[PDB]
Enzyme design. Structure first.
Site, PDB file in Angstrom:
ATOM      1  N   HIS A   8      44.198  80.766  31.483  1.00 14.60           N
ATOM      2  CA  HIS A   8      44.613  81.573  32.621  1.00 14.60           C
ATOM      3  C   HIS A   8      43.933  82.929  32.631  1.00 14.60           C
ATOM      4  CE1 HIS A   8      47.586  83.988  35.050  1.00 14.60           C
ATOM      5  NE2 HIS A   8      47.349  82.959  35.844  1.00 14.60           N
ATOM      6  N   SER A  12      39.770  78.512  35.409  1.00 19.16           N
ATOM      7  CA  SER A  12      39.137  77.238  35.109  1.00 19.16           C
ATOM      8  C   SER A  12      37.764  77.149  35.763  1.00 19.16           C
ATOM      9  CB  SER A  12      40.015  76.081  35.584  1.00 19.16           C
ATOM     10  OG  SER A  12      39.425  74.834  35.269  1.00 19.16           O
ATOM     11  N   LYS A  34      46.837  66.333  43.599  1.00 15.50           N
ATOM     12  CA  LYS A  34      45.816  65.641  42.819  1.00 15.50           C
ATOM     13  C   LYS A  34      46.347  65.290  41.432  1.00 15.50           C
ATOM     14  CE  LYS A  34      41.463  66.540  43.084  1.00 15.50           C
ATOM     15  NZ  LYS A  34      40.084  67.030  43.332  1.00 15.50           N
ATOM     16  N   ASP A  35      47.115  66.200  40.829  1.00 13.39           N
ATOM     17  CA  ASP A  35      47.735  65.909  39.544  1.00 13.39           C
ATOM     18  C   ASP A  35      48.711  64.747  39.657  1.00 13.39           C
ATOM     19  OD1 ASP A  35      46.342  67.859  38.123  1.00 13.39           O
ATOM     20  OD2 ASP A  35      47.819  69.413  38.587  1.00 13.39           O
ATOM     21  N   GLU A  78      43.699  53.137  13.653  1.00 16.37           N
ATOM     22  CA  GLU A  78      43.748  52.794  15.062  1.00 16.37           C
ATOM     23  C   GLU A  78      42.424  53.169  15.719  1.00 16.37           C
ATOM     24  OE1 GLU A  78      47.114  54.454  17.241  1.00 16.37           O
ATOM     25  OE2 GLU A  78      47.709  52.397  17.710  1.00 16.37           O
TER      26      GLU A  78
HETATM   27  C1  LIG Z   1      44.860  52.921   8.356  1.00 10.98           C
HETATM   28  C2  LIG Z   1      43.852  54.049   8.142  1.00 10.98           C
HETATM   29  C3  LIG Z   1      42.766  53.796   7.335  1.00 10.98           C
HETATM   30  C4  LIG Z   1      41.785  54.753   7.085  1.00 10.98           C
HETATM   31  C5  LIG Z   1      41.880  56.028   7.656  1.00 10.98           C
HETATM   32  C6  LIG Z   1      42.955  56.334   8.477  1.00 10.98           C
HETATM   33  C7  LIG Z   1      43.448  57.412   9.228  1.00 10.98           C
HETATM   34  C8  LIG Z   1      42.749  58.767   9.331  1.00 10.98           C
HETATM   35  C9  LIG Z   1      43.478  59.862   9.346  1.00 10.98           C
HETATM   36  C10 LIG Z   1      42.808  61.227   9.464  1.00 10.98           C
HETATM   37  C11 LIG Z   1      43.662  62.488   9.467  1.00 10.98           C
HETATM   38  F1  LIG Z   1      43.276  63.304   8.445  1.00 10.98           F
HETATM   39  F2  LIG Z   1      43.502  63.137  10.655  1.00 10.98           F
HETATM   40  F3  LIG Z   1      44.970  62.142   9.308  1.00 10.98           F
HETATM   41  C12 LIG Z   1      41.502  61.317   9.566  1.00 10.98           C
HETATM   42  C13 LIG Z   1      40.657  60.050   9.564  1.00 10.98           C
HETATM   43  C14 LIG Z   1      41.233  58.873   9.460  1.00 10.98           C
HETATM   44  F4  LIG Z   1      40.459  57.753   9.461  1.00 10.98           F
HETATM   45  N1  LIG Z   1      44.498  57.272   9.858  1.00 10.98           N
HETATM   46  N2  LIG Z   1      44.891  56.033   9.608  1.00 10.98           N
HETATM   47  C15 LIG Z   1      46.107  55.529  10.202  1.00 10.98           C
HETATM   48  C16 LIG Z   1      46.011  55.851  11.683  1.00 10.98           C
HETATM   49  N3  LIG Z   1      44.902  55.693  12.453  1.00 10.98           N
HETATM   50  N4  LIG Z   1      45.190  56.089  13.706  1.00 10.98           N
HETATM   51  N5  LIG Z   1      46.483  56.505  13.723  1.00 10.98           N
HETATM   52  C17 LIG Z   1      47.201  57.015  14.871  1.00 10.98           C
HETATM   53  N6  LIG Z   1      47.006  56.363  12.446  1.00 10.98           N
HETATM   54  C18 LIG Z   1      43.973  55.289   8.721  1.00 10.98           C
END
Ligand SMILES: Cc1cccc2c(-c3cc(C(F)(F)F)ccc3F)nn(Cc3nnn(C)n3)c12
Lengths: 97, 417
Positions: A8, A12, A34-35, A78
């Site tokens: 702010h 932007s 729009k949001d 993930e």
């Molecule tokens: C299951 C698993 C395996 C290997 C690494 C990770 C990580 C992970 C976490 C970080 C942080 F330091 F930021 F924590 C940085 C890099 C990483 F690879 N996390 N996880 C579980 C997971 N993956 N995604 N989520 C929502 N949880 C892993």
């Protein structure tokens, strides 16, 4: 909130990459609506995933009760942590990783 | 003595003869203003009237009346010299084409162009002139009454001669008079001297209101000038006086006036909590069939334009709800006085009587207008407010320091809650 205030203070940016001061509009109603459009699109796709395909983004192995004695064939985060974890896999040294 | 006289030809002589008039005036009008022009010939009606009004007068004061709808020459003289003034204008009209044919328009065009530019220089006249056009964009009514510069220089004697022959005809012309004189003597004097060609009354070119916004942001000006208005009732509309009454409810205001802190309109008290606006003026401009109801406002602060538009438009909402009887009684009285004030000068009533006789075909004296306004109840105003104000499209104009004037959707949305 801190990010919003840091925004702010100077406002932007815009796609053209020039000063917006020549032509500004109030956030309401234009950009409020729009949001709302983007919010309803997001919620519609979010409903697709939540209801009709929730576990695709997740990993099936997470539904196995965890036990330290058994290691899964692939310890992987993930999807959205993958780009960073890839780096961690690439660098030999753990500290360097 | 409002009585009317129709000459051997269809010209009607309407005279508001009245004893105790300080001075008398006579004027011949033909219903061809900027309404009856088009962009190529815009301003020709004003130019052709100025040329006629520029003719030598036998001690009389010839002045040109230029307006969106009607246009004519007015001669003002002492009550004893009215007949000479009457014979004078008849001489001007009968010789109108001959005068214009030999007339060199270069000097007159310079005067007209100077007038048009001076209108643009004055912010109120620019804002109002832009406001009228923006409401009626695409139609002839949008044309400026005195025209514009670039239009004028293209004018030529042929353009005006075509204009006069089209419009200066018996059925499209009226003669107005006012003062302490005998009506019959003036009528006989005109008949013996007025010779104009016959012709059908030119159909009045249609115009329709289109809510829009015209912004001319000018950061070099010291104040922000804005006008916001809706499609108000024009002449020959039963609500004509009602629209004026509604305007007087909010009335006028000037921050540096001794009356500012003590005036009745609610909006006046509201704006002084912050000195939001320096002056604003509510008006009901009425044309032959279309009218514009709104206000004009000059704001001397960059940061309070949105505040004024918000509060002023909020106050408009109260026309349809919570309008007080005292306000209506005030507005009725204020309009009646303002209506009577306009008709004091013999010049003003001559212009007024000419306008009505052309644009509506009949005129109401103050006696009838007072009988009409006095009968306006609160319900009639509220019904009008819902009809013409509540959630109705607005037209916005503004020239100076407009940066704070929020865009259309904001102001337009304030018209309903
Ligand atoms: C299951 C698993 C395996 C290997 C690494 C990770 C990580 C992970 C976490 C970080 C942080 F330091 F930021 F924590 C940085 C890099 C990483 F690879 N996390 N996880 C579980 C997971 N993956 N995604 N989520 C929502 N949880 C892993």
């Amino acid at each position: 909130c801190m990010h919003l205030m840091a925004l702010h203070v100077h406002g932007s940016s815009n796609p053209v990459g020039i000063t917006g001061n020549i032509d500004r509009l109030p956030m309401h109603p234009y950009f409020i609506f729009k949001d709302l459009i983007t919010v309803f699109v997001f919620l519609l796709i979010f409903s697709l995933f939540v209801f009709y395909s929730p576990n695709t983004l997740g990993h099936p192995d997470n539904y196995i009760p965890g036990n330290p004695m058994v290691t899964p064939p692939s310890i992987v985060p993930e999807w959205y942590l993958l780009p960073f974890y890839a780096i961690l896999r690439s660098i030999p040294d753990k500290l360097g990783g | 003595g409002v009585k009317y006289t129709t000459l051997s030809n269809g010209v009607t002589v309407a005279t508001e003869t009245n004893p105790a008039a300080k001075t008398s005036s006579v004027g011949l009008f033909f219903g061809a203003g900027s309404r009856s022009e088009h962009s190529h010939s815009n301003g020709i009606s004003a130019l052709t009237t100025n040329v006629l009004a520029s003719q030598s007068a036998k001690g009389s004061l010839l002045t040109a009346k230029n307006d969106r709808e009607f246009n004519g020459i007015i001669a003002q003289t002492t009550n004893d010299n009215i007949t000479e003034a009457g014979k004078l204008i008849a001489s001007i009209a009968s010789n109108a084409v001959d005068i214009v044919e030999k007339t060199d328009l270069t000097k007159h065009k310079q005067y007209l162009s100077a007038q048009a530019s001076a209108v643009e220089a004055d912010p109120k006249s620019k804002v109002l002139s832009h406001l009228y056009s923006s409401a009626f964009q695409g139609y002839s009514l949008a044309l400026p009454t005195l025209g514009t510069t670039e239009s004028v220089e293209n004018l030529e004697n042929q353009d005006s001669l075509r204009h006069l022959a089209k419009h200066l005809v018996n059925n499209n012309t009226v003669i107005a008079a006012s003062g302490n004189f005998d009506h019959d003597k003036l009528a006989d004097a005109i008949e013996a001297n007025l010779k104009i060609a016959e012709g059908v009354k030119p159909e009045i070119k249609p115009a329709s209101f289109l809510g829009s916004e015209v912004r001319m942001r000018d950061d070099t000006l010291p104040k922000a000038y804005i006008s916001i208005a809706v499609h108000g009732e024009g002449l020959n509309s039963p609500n004509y006086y009602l629209a004026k009454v509604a305007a007087a409810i909010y009335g006028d205001f000037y921050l540096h006036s001794t009356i500012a802190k003590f005036t009745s309109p609610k909006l006046a008290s509201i704006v002084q909590e912050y000195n939001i606006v320096e002056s604003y003026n509510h008006y009901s401009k009425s044309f032959s069939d279309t009218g514009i109801w709104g206000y004009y406002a000059e704001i001397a602060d960059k940061f309070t334009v949105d505040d004024f538009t918000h509060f002023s438009l909020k106050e408009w909402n109260r026309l349809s709800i919570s309008i007080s009887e005292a306000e209506v009684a005030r507005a009725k009285a204020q309009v009646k006085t303002a209506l009577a004030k306009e008709l004091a000068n013999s010049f003003a009533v001559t212009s007024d009587i000419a306008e009505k006789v052309l644009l509506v075909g009949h005129r109401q004296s103050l006696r009838e207008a007072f009988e009409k306004i006095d009968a306006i109840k609160v319900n009639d105003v509220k019904e009008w407010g819902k009809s013409k104000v509540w959630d109705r499209d607005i037209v916005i104009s503004g020239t100076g320091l407009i940066e704070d004037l929020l865009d259309y959707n904001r102001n337009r949305n304030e018209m309903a809650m």
